[PDB]
Write a structure and sequence with these properties.
Chain A: In plastids the minimal PEP RNA polymerase catalytic core is composed of four subunits: alpha, beta, beta', and beta''. When a (nuclear-encoded) sigma factor is associated with the core the holoenzyme is formed, which can initiate transcription. The structure is cut from a larger assembly and holds ten protein chains of seven kinds. With 114 residues, chain C is an all-alpha fold. In chain C, 44% of the residues lie in helices and 3% in strands. Chain C contains four helices and one strand, in the order H-H-H-H-E. The termini of chain C are far apart. The relative contact order of chain C is 0.09. Chain G has 216 residues and is an alpha+beta fold. Chain G is 19% helix and 43% strand. Chain G starts with a strand and ends in a 9-residue tail after the last helix. Chain I is mainly beta and 204 residues long. Chain I has an eight-stranded mixed β-sheet with strand order 1-2-3-5-6-7-8-4, with no helix packed on it. In chain I, strands 9-11-10 form a three-stranded mixed β-sheet, with no helix packed on it. Chain J contains 14 helices and 17 strands. Helices cover 39% and strands 16% of the residues of chain J. Chain J is of the alpha+beta class and 408 residues long. The chains are: A alpha+beta (86), B alpha+beta (122), C mainly alpha (114), E mainly alpha (107), G alpha+beta (216), I mainly beta (204), J alpha+beta (408). At the B-I interface, strand 3 and strand 4 of B face strand 5, strand 6, strand 10 and helix 1 of I. Strand 1 of chain C pairs antiparallel with strand 12 of chain G. The complex binds S-adenosyl-L-homocysteine (SAH) and zinc ion (ZN). Zinc ion binds next to helix 2 of chain A. Chain E binds one RNA strand of 10 nucleotides through loops.
Amino acid sequence: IGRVLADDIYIGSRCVAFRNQDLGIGLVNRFITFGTQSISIRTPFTCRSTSWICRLCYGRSPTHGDLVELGEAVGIIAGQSIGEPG
Amino acid sequence: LIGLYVLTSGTRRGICANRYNPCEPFFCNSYDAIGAYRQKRINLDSPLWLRWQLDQRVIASKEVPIEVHYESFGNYHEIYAHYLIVRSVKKETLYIYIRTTVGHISFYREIEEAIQGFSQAC
Amino acid sequence: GIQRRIWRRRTLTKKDDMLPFVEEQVRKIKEVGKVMTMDIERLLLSEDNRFEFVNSVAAEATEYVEKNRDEYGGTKKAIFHVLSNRVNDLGFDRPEAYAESDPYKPGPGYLKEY
Amino acid sequence: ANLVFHNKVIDGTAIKRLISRLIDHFGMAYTSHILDQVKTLGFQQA
Amino acid sequence: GHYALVTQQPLRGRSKQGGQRVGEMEVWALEGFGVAHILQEMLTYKSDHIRARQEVLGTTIIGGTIPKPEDAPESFRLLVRELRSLALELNHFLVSEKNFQINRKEV
Amino acid sequence: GTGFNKGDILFYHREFC
Amino acid sequence: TLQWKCVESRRDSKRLYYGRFILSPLMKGQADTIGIAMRRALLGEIEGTCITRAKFENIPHDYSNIVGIQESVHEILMNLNEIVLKSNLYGTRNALICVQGPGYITARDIILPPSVEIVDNTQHIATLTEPINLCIGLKIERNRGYSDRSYPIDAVFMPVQNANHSIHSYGNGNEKQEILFIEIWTNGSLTPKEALHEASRNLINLFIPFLHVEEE
Amino acid sequence: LSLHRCGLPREIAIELFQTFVIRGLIRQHLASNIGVAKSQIREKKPIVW
Amino acid sequence: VVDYRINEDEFHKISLLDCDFFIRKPPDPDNDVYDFREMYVTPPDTDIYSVPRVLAPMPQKYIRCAMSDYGCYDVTEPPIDAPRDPLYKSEREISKVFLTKHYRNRRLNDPEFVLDFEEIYVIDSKTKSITRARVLVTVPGGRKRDRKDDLLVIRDNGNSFKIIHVGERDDPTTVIEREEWTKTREDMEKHLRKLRDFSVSNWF
Amino acid sequence: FPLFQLESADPDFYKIGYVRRVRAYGVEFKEGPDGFGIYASKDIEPRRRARVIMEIPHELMITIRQKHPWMFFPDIVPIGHPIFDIINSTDPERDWDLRLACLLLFSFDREDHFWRLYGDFLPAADECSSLLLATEEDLAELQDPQLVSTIRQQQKRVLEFWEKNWHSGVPLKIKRLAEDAERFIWAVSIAQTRCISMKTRIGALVQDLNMMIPYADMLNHSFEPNCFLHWRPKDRILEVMSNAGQAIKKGEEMTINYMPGQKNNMLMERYGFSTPVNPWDAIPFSGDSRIHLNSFLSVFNIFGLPEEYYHDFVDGAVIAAARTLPTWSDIDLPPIPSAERKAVKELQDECRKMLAEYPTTSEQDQKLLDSLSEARTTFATAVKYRMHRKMFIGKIIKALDIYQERLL
RNA sequence: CCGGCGCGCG
Ligand SMILES: Nc1ncnc2c1ncn2[C@@H]1O[C@H](CSCC[C@H](N)C(=O)O)[C@@H](O)[C@H]1O
Ligand SMILES: [Zn+2]
């Protein structure tokens, strides 16, 4: 949930999910309902940088629902999120 | 959390409600039920029947009616675990009565009134 | 379709089934200032970036303060005025800078105790 | 508001799930007021 | 009120009428919120910017808008001198994006 | 956050009348 | 001096009246006691008028439905329970319904005892399609809230639908002052000002007897 | 309290907002200068609140 | 499975959860007349017709019948993807359809219209079949009685059909309480059975 | 003292929208003999920015991707439906209206779809002004062989598509969508006359869509509109916004530019209507006689670049004349009046020859319209089109006369 | 207005 597809998804001759599209839970259930074996998504591992990240490779905002906004300090949030329950 | 749990904890049922094997007020609207509760006519968890004038939106088990009382004049009553539905073959009328308590009604009214008040204030 | 003018009125001709004690609640909402929270949420529905929204609001408030310094800082706040004006610019009427007072204060010197 | 009518129980898991669904449907401003009202109701019944 | 002699930061302690510390964990939270101007307030002219502390005292009494400090706080200048005592020079340079002129900031 | 991306003719010439 | 005033009034419909009232200046702790007593009096000590019993004549065979009437007997009773009345009656009186045939039966079709009025004449009772005369014998009572083949009606005597009180406190140093706010919602059979006055009178009548003395 | 409100002690509030209270005093001609306003604040006058 | 597409303008299309049931409809202003000689069952919204399975003798003459569905409500909380997605979804899962013959094929508008509860045909969605109801009559009178005073009771997932006098009608509260008492009594007996003094204990 | 001192639309029309989060601010829907329209229910005070007029949620629309592959938003077509096979066989470039018509029929057949109810307020076959419903008699009154040929080609294409895809062997779920040809023709006409194309972002996906937007197709067309459409992606809402700083009086119609820079012929081809103040209309002149562009603009107070002519008698007709009249410019060379008089006389002669080419005149066309009692909508549409062309030529003549008058 | 030591609170 919240990941951005890196490739188009097809069911037969029909496109059910396009490249550069946020993954809702309805789309995920549709993938599980049918026989979809491979899903290609954009993650922090796929971004073309280790000094910053882009909106599409990060995905949806953890708190604001929509796609993440430019200028967000996602690294500090990532560090705080893991160390907080320690 | 405890307050909400006690409020929405429903009726005592079965052997915890009747000493013997059995071989409730009807309210036009929720305001009448809460008013009766204020005047100490009913308890917080005493069962009651509430007239429903909206669509069927009560969360309940997906079960067929326990009993269908079909009259020779056409009207039939479908009795479920938590509501009663009156239907007819002559007309398109459909009456719904929900078996609930004052606590569930109070929770629903609290959330509904919060939404309506916020909408009206803006 | 022209006949003399007489014309056919368009009607629903179909059935759609989808067709009061909150006075204290609404008044309390207005008193505490939750309408401003709704307005702030509404203003951000048209902003791609919220940081840019905050920066623009701060710049507009700064311009307001520089232009008319003595009108702000008391019952009127520059940021509140900016937010009200931005809400008013959409056509939704709001009190100026969300400035409200208590009509039931029993004369000067009396301070409300929470 | 097209709210479902809960008729069984409201426990810790149910209230957490209900609030999350309210934020998605109504937003954070509406849900912030719903939380204020529900907090009073829970305190009043405890 | 009163500030430290060396760091020029507000004193510590209720008995000394000192201020509250904004530690590095508090700075992380502000960076997580993205409130870059709240952070700069508590880093320069509420703690140790001697020049900008005096102007904030004046602007707020007349209500005439607080400008950005743009200079270095006394904690950074204190660190530069200490690094100078280890035979190390630390210079802050601004490169103009217009004409690419290098500007040496006073530190 | 908020710090991202750096945050007279026609006069003295009127008709004499 | 201690004075009261109505600070808000509204009439959303004919059966929904709202009013907000004020009372100031008050001493510390007085406003809470007054509000509690007034709310209890408004909610249960005010007399209301309701239909408490219905008799179905014309031999309906005591069945669930009557031929020609769209609504069932239980539906008719539920509709009758919703009718808002006001009166000054002492004891119990009787009302009758006699509608000739097809059409809509509303509160307007009720023959009333002398002192009984009807707040809303548009309240629906039953719908008649075929021309059959319908005879219903209503029993009307006047009672407090806290108090033969004829079907009873579980009437709730609540002319005041809701009531609330709130306290505002003020002070400058050693002298304090508080203000009492009272909100009253009525079903139109009585105005919020009338409800306030009736509640005050009922409370005073409840506390008069403690000052009674007896002849020697 | 509301979800967006907090309660501040009177002493903490008067300490934190001292400059704003001085401006409010001077603006409505109730204080001659900054020193007089500070003296009024120190005396806990009823108009400071 | 048949090898032709029937015309649905002359058929009674009865839609259930698992299938759509077709019964030939003789023309009539009331549209309550059914011809059971020709029948077809299809998957929902599909024109691949098939002969339904029959578990009982079917009528040969045209009979006027009243249709009433049997099932449950599916009130679910669907996941919220888009803005303003519905908080709940309620749909009527019809699993059985009862066809009750009018007494002597009387019309609804007839002032003497009564329902014949001894003639009920049950359509099952799960099995894609149609059956006749096993009706048990308790009202005195036998074959000849006043049909205006009888009441039909359907229990056991639409399998138990019983005719009783209207006077002995059971309150909905009584039915719900009976079910609750039975289930809770069995549950309590199961819970207490694991105690080792259960055999020397009383219920009360 | 208080004591001493077009019809409203069906309330259910807005009510069905209102219960589904459709909001209209400061405007009311009105119905007339021509059709539906949106008018300001009060005086809209010009604010600093654009004002929100209406808000239509995304879930109430029927949108299809403008580019291959075809993906619908919201996805109403189930997987494996034959309607997808019918849609997917269309030509990607020119067959956009067929896909929208298929979607419209599918939605009309859907029980829970909103457009099943909203489709009852669409103009019927006898009320729609699209030329796809016009017969040969109505097309004969266009007095333009090019437009007539284009309309015949469009009708032939629509009927060929319907015949190819709605033959005998189609399943029942497809046959009931359009049992006979004119139903599909009406669907295509509605799609052509009410489709809105826009670049919308949904979530993280930005794409162009062909959209059937309820309550937004209600707005009428204008080349000087007071409203415009803005898509709000955060909550997926289409906003109708009045122009910033433009006062709107009570009862003033709400209008948007259906398509900019399109002449009356293309408007008649697509939306089935034309306007007399079209500032892009073209009259083919010989080009031998030319006037001074700068003087023509200055006399009538027409400023801005050739692509943004605007006025400070002068209307869009004068702008169209300035854009279509043969003009010469030499930076700062003034025109000598004598050649201007001869040039405008020759141009007026050409315009009068063009008017004489038409069998009838414009005033007689207006009289025929006023006396018309048993004609279809397309008949009056064609009559209005030719009359509007005649008035455009006449306005050109009058503008040339007054320009030669004010040259001294 | 500087640092060490001891005792505490969350
Ligand atoms: N300015 C205008 N003058 C005359 N007709 C117009 C017009 N703008 C749009 N139309 C017509 O309105 C249609 C667009 S849908 C607009 C509402 C429509 N009139 C109705 O009642 O449903 C087009 O087919 C076009 O023929
Ligand atoms: Zn990336």
